[PDB]
Paper text:
One group of metal ion efflux transporters that regulates metal ion homeostasis and can be found in all domains of life is the Cation Diffusion Facilitator (CDF) protein family. One of the most highly conserved and abundant integral MM proteins is the CDF transporter MamM. MamM was recently proposed to function as a magnetosome-directed iron transporter required for iron biomineralization since its deletion abolished magnetite biomineralization and mutation of residues within the conserved TMD metal-binding site resulted in alterations of magnetite crystal size, morphology and even mineral phase. To summarize our results we present an alternative model for the CDF CTD mode of action, in which we propose that upon metal cation binding, the CTD induces conformational changes towards a tighter and more compact fold which allows the activation of iron transport through the TMD.
The central binding site D249A mutant also displayed a significantly decreased magnetic response that correlated with reduced numbers of magnetite particles per cell (−47%; P<0.001, Mann-Whitney test). Furthermore, only the D249A and E289A single mutants revealed an additional slight decrease of the magnetic response during iron induction experiments with iron-starved cells. Therefore, the reduced magnetite formation reflects decreased MamM activities caused by less (e.g. MamM D249A) and/or shorter (e.g. MamM D249A+H264A) TMD activation events. To confirm that these observed phenotypic differences are due to true transport function alternations, we also examined the expression levels of all MamM mutants, their ability to stabilize MamB expression, performed MD simulations for dimer stability evaluation and determined their CTD structures. (ii) All mutants exhibited an apo-MamM CTD-like behavior along the MD simulations, and (iii) an absence of structural differences was observed.
Author numbering:
A (entry chain A), B (entry chain A): 213 to 292
Amino acid sequence: HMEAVQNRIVEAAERVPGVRGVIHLRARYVGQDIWAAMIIGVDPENTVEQAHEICEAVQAAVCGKIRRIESLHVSAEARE
Amino acid sequence: HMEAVQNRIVEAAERVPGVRGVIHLRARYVGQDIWAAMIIGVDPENTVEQAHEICEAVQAAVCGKIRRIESLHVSAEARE
Ligand code: NA
Ligand code: NA
């Protein structure tokens, strides 16, 4: 149930160009809404600006696909 | 007093190669120790790996100069 929604979140994020895994996801219910914080992996050789753009793209993809999410903060860390 | 130490933290961070301001600093006392979390600005065209290296350098500089700090998490965001 909560796991079903967390699966959907990860899957959604992973389908965005430049995402190299979901490193961390904390989702919590505030009433019927989800508030969440995500850390994604990205190519270490992407620029900081590119990584920002991927994060923004993840936020839009995830928010667009999972209607119950009302807050989502995405940050990036180097992976592989 | 608490402000004096926060000033020292910011000053220390700002003297590290690649730091473009301190965007955020939250420092709190746990007993006599400081636990802190910092966000620094960096060149948007630095790579994610470079930004990681600057963060690590800030952690070392700040920890080295302010002995009461016992925990310090540094992250980076694009600035100017
Ligand atoms: Na890439
Ligand atoms: Na630079």
